[PDB]
Design a protein around this motif. Structure first.
Motif, PDB file in Angstrom:
ATOM      1  N   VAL A  12      -0.748   0.732 -11.653  1.00  0.00           N
ATOM      2  CA  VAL A  12      -0.578  -0.392 -11.905  1.00  0.00           C
ATOM      3  C   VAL A  12       1.163   0.373 -12.009  1.00  0.00           C
ATOM      4  CG1 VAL A  12      -0.505  -0.019 -14.365  1.00  0.00           C
ATOM      5  CG2 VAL A  12      -2.686  -0.065 -14.141  1.00  0.00           C
ATOM      6  N   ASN A  13       2.029  -1.051 -11.714  1.00  0.00           N
ATOM      7  CA  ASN A  13       3.119  -0.621 -11.503  1.00  0.00           C
ATOM      8  C   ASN A  13       3.432   0.406 -10.590  1.00  0.00           C
ATOM      9  OD1 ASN A  13       3.626  -1.682 -14.962  1.00  0.00           O
ATOM     10  ND2 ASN A  13       3.884  -0.254 -15.404  1.00  0.00           N
ATOM     11  N   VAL A  14       3.084  -0.610  -9.504  1.00  0.00           N
ATOM     12  CA  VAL A  14       3.253   0.531  -8.034  1.00  0.00           C
ATOM     13  C   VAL A  14       4.124  -0.039  -7.753  1.00  0.00           C
ATOM     14  CG1 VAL A  14       1.826   1.061  -5.926  1.00  0.00           C
ATOM     15  CG2 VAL A  14       0.657   0.875  -8.176  1.00  0.00           C
ATOM     16  N   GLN A  15       5.547   0.566  -7.233  1.00  0.00           N
ATOM     17  CA  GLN A  15       6.456  -0.140  -6.804  1.00  0.00           C
ATOM     18  C   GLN A  15       6.380   0.635  -5.552  1.00  0.00           C
ATOM     19  OE1 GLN A  15      11.278   0.940  -7.199  1.00  0.00           O
ATOM     20  NE2 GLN A  15      10.183   2.974  -7.522  1.00  0.00           N
ATOM     21  N   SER A  16       7.309  -0.402  -4.487  1.00  0.00           N
ATOM     22  CA  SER A  16       7.012  -0.341  -2.765  1.00  0.00           C
ATOM     23  C   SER A  16       7.935  -1.256  -2.895  1.00  0.00           C
ATOM     24  CB  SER A  16       5.877  -0.630  -3.008  1.00  0.00           C
ATOM     25  OG  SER A  16       5.824  -0.008  -1.490  1.00  0.00           O
ATOM     26  N   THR A  17       8.091  -0.691  -0.988  1.00  0.00           N
ATOM     27  CA  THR A  17       9.477  -2.601  -0.206  1.00  0.00           C
ATOM     28  C   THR A  17       8.214  -3.469  -0.660  1.00  0.00           C
ATOM     29  OG1 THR A  17       7.417  -1.541   1.496  1.00  0.00           O
ATOM     30  CG2 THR A  17       9.306  -0.169   1.406  1.00  0.00           C
ATOM     31  N   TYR A  18       9.368  -4.397  -0.421  1.00  0.00           N
ATOM     32  CA  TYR A  18       9.306  -6.286  -0.999  1.00  0.00           C
ATOM     33  C   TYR A  18      10.830  -6.805   0.314  1.00  0.00           C
ATOM     34  CZ  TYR A  18       7.523  -9.544  -3.546  1.00  0.00           C
ATOM     35  OH  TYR A  18       6.814 -10.482  -4.190  1.00  0.00           O
ATOM     36  N   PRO A  19       9.771  -7.715   0.441  1.00  0.00           N
ATOM     37  CA  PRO A  19      11.014  -8.804   1.349  1.00  0.00           C
ATOM     38  C   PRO A  19      12.211  -8.746   0.626  1.00  0.00           C
ATOM     39  CG  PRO A  19       8.175  -9.680   1.996  1.00  0.00           C
ATOM     40  CD  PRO A  19       9.309  -8.724   0.240  1.00  0.00           C
ATOM     41  N   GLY A  20      13.213  -9.055   1.679  1.00  0.00           N
ATOM     42  CA  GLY A  20      14.606  -9.237   1.042  1.00  0.00           C
ATOM     43  C   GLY A  20      15.194  -8.212   1.143  1.00  0.00           C
ATOM     44  N   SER A  21      14.145  -6.540   2.285  1.00  0.00           N
ATOM     45  CA  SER A  21      15.151  -5.450   1.805  1.00  0.00           C
ATOM     46  C   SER A  21      14.835  -5.453   0.713  1.00  0.00           C
ATOM     47  CB  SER A  21      16.394  -5.777   3.083  1.00  0.00           C
ATOM     48  OG  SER A  21      15.800  -5.950   3.694  1.00  0.00           O
ATOM     49  N   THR A  22      14.209  -4.948  -0.610  1.00  0.00           N
ATOM     50  CA  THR A  22      14.432  -5.137  -1.733  1.00  0.00           C
ATOM     51  C   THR A  22      12.973  -3.828  -1.977  1.00  0.00           C
ATOM     52  OG1 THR A  22      14.464  -5.404  -3.724  1.00  0.00           O
ATOM     53  CG2 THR A  22      13.052  -6.983  -2.668  1.00  0.00           C
ATOM     54  N   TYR A  23      12.825  -4.208  -3.334  1.00  0.00           N
ATOM     55  CA  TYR A  23      11.715  -3.018  -3.986  1.00  0.00           C
ATOM     56  C   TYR A  23      10.974  -3.624  -5.223  1.00  0.00           C
ATOM     57  CZ  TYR A  23      14.317   0.290  -0.541  1.00  0.00           C
ATOM     58  OH  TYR A  23      14.090   0.366  -0.133  1.00  0.00           O
ATOM     59  N   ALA A  24      10.124  -3.710  -5.430  1.00  0.00           N
ATOM     60  CA  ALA A  24       9.631  -4.252  -6.609  1.00  0.00           C
ATOM     61  C   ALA A  24       7.802  -3.668  -7.048  1.00  0.00           C
ATOM     62  CB  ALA A  24       8.393  -5.633  -5.872  1.00  0.00           C
ATOM     63  N   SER A  25       7.835  -3.911  -8.102  1.00  0.00           N
ATOM     64  CA  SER A  25       6.339  -3.307  -8.860  1.00  0.00           C
ATOM     65  C   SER A  25       5.337  -3.837  -9.105  1.00  0.00           C
ATOM     66  CB  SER A  25       7.068  -2.609 -10.431  1.00  0.00           C
ATOM     67  OG  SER A  25       7.520  -1.086  -9.604  1.00  0.00           O
ATOM     68  N   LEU A  26       4.538  -3.569  -8.813  1.00  0.00           N
ATOM     69  CA  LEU A  26       3.065  -4.445  -8.445  1.00  0.00           C
ATOM     70  C   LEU A  26       1.641  -3.712  -9.359  1.00  0.00           C
ATOM     71  CD1 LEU A  26       3.208  -7.455  -4.941  1.00  0.00           C
ATOM     72  CD2 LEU A  26       3.677  -7.567  -7.700  1.00  0.00           C
ATOM     73  N   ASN A  27       0.781  -4.418  -9.182  1.00  0.00           N
ATOM     74  CA  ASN A  27      -0.088  -4.290 -10.352  1.00  0.00           C
ATOM     75  C   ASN A  27      -1.643  -4.625  -9.103  1.00  0.00           C
ATOM     76  OD1 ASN A  27       0.941  -3.151 -12.664  1.00  0.00           O
ATOM     77  ND2 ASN A  27       1.017  -5.491 -13.222  1.00  0.00           N
ATOM     78  N   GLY A  28      -2.377  -4.068  -9.169  1.00  0.00           N
ATOM     79  CA  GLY A  28      -3.741  -4.293  -8.232  1.00  0.00           C
ATOM     80  C   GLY A  28      -4.577  -3.838  -7.531  1.00  0.00           C
ATOM     81  N   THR A  29      -5.976  -4.082  -7.521  1.00  0.00           N
ATOM     82  CA  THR A  29      -7.056  -2.790  -7.030  1.00  0.00           C
ATOM     83  C   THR A  29      -6.306  -2.691  -5.253  1.00  0.00           C
ATOM     84  OG1 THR A  29      -8.405  -4.343  -6.377  1.00  0.00           O
ATOM     85  CG2 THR A  29      -8.704  -2.714  -8.448  1.00  0.00           C
ATOM     86  N   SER A  30      -5.635  -3.613  -4.894  1.00  0.00           N
ATOM     87  CA  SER A  30      -5.108  -4.106  -3.512  1.00  0.00           C
ATOM     88  C   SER A  30      -3.728  -2.498  -3.433  1.00  0.00           C
ATOM     89  CB  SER A  30      -4.550  -5.138  -3.401  1.00  0.00           C
ATOM     90  OG  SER A  30      -5.470  -6.291  -2.960  1.00  0.00           O
ATOM     91  N   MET A  31      -3.203  -2.597  -4.761  1.00  0.00           N
ATOM     92  CA  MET A  31      -2.060  -1.560  -4.833  1.00  0.00           C
ATOM     93  C   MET A  31      -2.358   0.010  -4.621  1.00  0.00           C
ATOM     94  SD  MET A  31      -0.664  -4.102  -5.766  1.00  0.00           S
ATOM     95  CE  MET A  31      -0.542  -4.839  -4.130  1.00  0.00           C
TER      96      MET A  31
END
Ligand SMILES: [Ca+2]
Ligand SMILES: [Ca+2]
Length: 269
Positions: A197-216
């Protein structure tokens, strides 16, 4: 400045990095939407099985996010993966819209086993079984690949395919309270859980984003497996998988949590 996402410290990765375990020499394949070039990732290679998207670059964001939880580089920027030294491979089996065939996913697993990957991280799930998929799973497994897959985000008391298969290590997701996240599928076949939950990681566009999921949650376990592999170079996929479960922190019901929360410090000891 580099920050350590809460999930990374939850699984105790830093304690393992302090003993010199970083995932060095372990080959990890991310079967997802691709991995975009990013200043906090080191992508060694890959293949695309998506007709129409010959490149391994990610048009969705999901794969890049998964890859950063495993191995965001240990430096002065962005975030930090569980295994920051792992050899990362981009295996594109899903297109930018996030979907793809069981056929493409099977080709990516075959690729992993043909290319001597140690761990394969699979973000996808299906409520229905697939003989094609199942066969690929078993084939990668017999070629030494540890296949780690997400339980699914339906919140149902049964887990998705291929995580449900005996040869896949099924991962569910927990919150910051160490409770099962509401969307996390559980039940029979569930092996372990990790932060989702609320997992912050690398994201395209040289930025960082927080997502939720079993895939995180999955990549936390893929990364912990690379630490154990580094520590015990002769262990097989089965040995690693049982050690993770054996050293996980009990969180209550094995129906809801399997073995418990992965603990990379306890496992890479
Ligand atoms: Ca970093
Ligand atoms: Ca399973």
């Amino acid at each position: 400045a580099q920050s350590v996402p809460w999930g990374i410290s939850r699984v105790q990765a830093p304690a393992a990095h302090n003993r010199g375990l970083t995932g060095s020499g372990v080959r990890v394949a991310v079967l997802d939407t691709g991995i975009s070039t990013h200043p906090d990732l080191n992508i060694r290679g890959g293949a695309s099985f998506v007709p129409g998207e010959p490149s391994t670059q990610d048009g969705n964001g999901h794969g890049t996010h998964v890859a950063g939880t495993i191995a965001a580089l240990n430096n002065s920027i962005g975030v930090l993966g569980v295994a920051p030294s792992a050899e990362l491979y981009a295996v594109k089996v899903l297109g930018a819209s996030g979907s793809g065939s069981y056929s493409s996913i099977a080709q990516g697993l075959e690729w992993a086993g043909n290319n001597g990957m140690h761990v394969a991280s699979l973000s996808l799930g299906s409520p229905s079984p697939s003989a094609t998929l199942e066969q690929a799973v078993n084939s990668a497994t017999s070629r030494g690949v540890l296949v780690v897959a997400a339980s699914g985000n339906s919140g149902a008391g049964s887990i998705s395919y291929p995580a449900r298969y005996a040869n896949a290590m099924a991962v569910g997701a927990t919150d910051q309270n160490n409770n099962r996240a509401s969307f996390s599928q559980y039940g029979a076949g569930l092996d372990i859980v990790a932060p989702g939950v609320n997992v912050q990681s690398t994201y395209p566009g040289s930025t960082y984003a927080s997502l939720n999921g079993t895939s995180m949650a999955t990549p936390h376990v893929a990364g912990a497996a690379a630490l154990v592999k580094q520590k015990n170079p002769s262990w097989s996929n089965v040995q690693i998988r049982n050690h993770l479960k054996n050293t996980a922190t009990s969180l209550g019901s094995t129906n809801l949590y399997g073995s418990g929360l992965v603990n990379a410090e306890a496992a890479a000891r």
